[PDB]
Ligand binder design. Structure first.
Ligand code: ADP
Ligand code: BEF
Ligand code: MG
Lengths: 210, 50
């Protein structure tokens, strides 16, 4: 099985999947506990697991592959990897890794990676030959990120006005100065929708903090 | 001629082998899961027994 297909489904799907697996009443546990139990039941039939997680390292040396279900926190679904793999495949924090994983073996309690398959959606060849971030040279934006949708609905105003108020470019350092209860939530909703419609190639990221 | 003398080195080597047989059993029972591209020849050996 793959972990992402347990990721994208809601809780009721996990409930019926566990009922298919002939499991005890599982409505009481966390979603990650249900995923852990289902993966254990699946591997008990002699099966391997496929997982995907963003990598994080502490001073302890070994690494943890977190999922987006808990917004990248510790959990029974995260994968434990030895420092040897980090030393070999040149891993570091933030490097999302997808590949073969196994349930925790005798005495273990978290998953362990077997073979890397996709390092940041890339083969380990060019992943090991990665240019350093701070070693790069910053520039300015010529690629104009068009905020206009072109449909011209009732709310599209808040986007098109930026096309004449604040131009947006790739790599721009932008900051909003606004009082509370003014309309920033729908504003960022609009900007996300507009950039996804006009530029679906760039990976979207939104930070919801506090 | 029928009584043999053993020094500190011989008994030290004997105790080393006594510990090495335990370490060997451990590395054998751990090698039951080890496959290619999963571990360096350092984690499978513990210093405790010998
Ligand atoms: N484009 C718009 N059209 C209609 N109503 C809007 C629009 N933008 C904001 N509002 C109103 O302003 C309010 C903004 O609420 P809220 O999201 O709490 O603001 P903020 O983003 O500052 O927290 C909403 O209740 C909504 O009714
Ligand atoms: F401006 Be509110 F607090 F979203
Ligand atoms: Mg808001």
């Amino acid at each position: 099985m793959n972990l992402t297909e347990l990721k994208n489904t809601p809780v009721s799907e996990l409930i019926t999947l566990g009922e298919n697996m002939g499991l005890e009443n599982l409505a009481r546990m966390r979603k990650q506990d249900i995923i852990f139990a289902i993966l254990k039941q699946h591997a008990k039939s002699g099966e391997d697991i496929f997982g995907d997680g963003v990598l994080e390292i502490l001073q302890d040396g070994f690494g943890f592959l977190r999922s987006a279900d808990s917004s990248y926190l510790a959990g029974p679904d995260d994968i434990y990897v030895s420092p040897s793999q980090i030393r070999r495949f040149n891993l570091r924090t933030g490097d999302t890794i997808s590949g073969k994983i196994r349930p925790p073996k005798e005495g273990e309690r978290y998953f362990a990676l077997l073979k890397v398959n996709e390092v940041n959606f890339d083969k380990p060849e060019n992943a090991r030959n990665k240019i350093l971030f701070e070693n790069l040279t910053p520039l300015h934006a010529n690629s104009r990120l068009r905020m206009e949708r072109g449909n011209g609905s009732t709310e599209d105003l808040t986007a098109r006005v930026l096309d004449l108020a604040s131009p947006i470019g790739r790599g721009q350092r932008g900051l909003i100065v606004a009082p509370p209860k003014a309309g920033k939530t729908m504003l960022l909703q609009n900007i996300a929708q507009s950039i996804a419609y006009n530029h679906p190639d760039c990976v979207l990221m939104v930070l919801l903090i506090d | 001629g029928n009584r043999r003398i053993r020094s500190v080195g011989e008994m030290a080597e004997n105790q080393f082998r006594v510990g090495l047989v335990r370490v060997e059993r451990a590395v054998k029972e751990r090698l039951s899961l080890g496959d290619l591209d999963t571990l360096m020849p350092q984690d499978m050996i513990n210093a405790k027994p010998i």
